[PDB]
């Protein structure tokens, strides 16, 4: 008839479980290089590229 429950604490470990996460195909497969750093504070709202002849 030993009652030891007050000798110990109730721990919550410092660890997290994995979440649900979307796949992100479209972001990783469209071209990201052309548009990088091209809109800035000299440019204004938008910006344009040249169609080939």
């Amino acid at each position: 008839p030993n009652n030891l429950d007050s000798n110990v604490s109730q721990i919550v470990l410092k660890k997290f479980l994995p979440g649900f996460m979307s796949d992100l195909v479209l972001a990783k497969t469209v071209d990201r290089q052309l548009l990088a750093g091209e809109i800035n504070s000299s440019t204004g709202d938008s910006v344009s590229f040249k169609r080939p002849h």
């Binding site: 809109i39 800035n40 504070s41 000299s42 440019t43 204004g44 709202d45």
Partner: protein
Amino acid sequence: QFSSLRTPTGDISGQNKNNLISGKATGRVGNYITVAVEYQQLEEAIKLNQLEE
């Protein structure tokens, strides 16, 4: 400032002397002079080059 008395013998007993009356000029603080401006974070990001100037 003082006045004077003009008497044949120069006894002033029956008359009244210069009082001493101080006065003062007061300087005060005026209102503030304030020029104030505000702009959106978006505007700084895409519109605001040369904000210094």
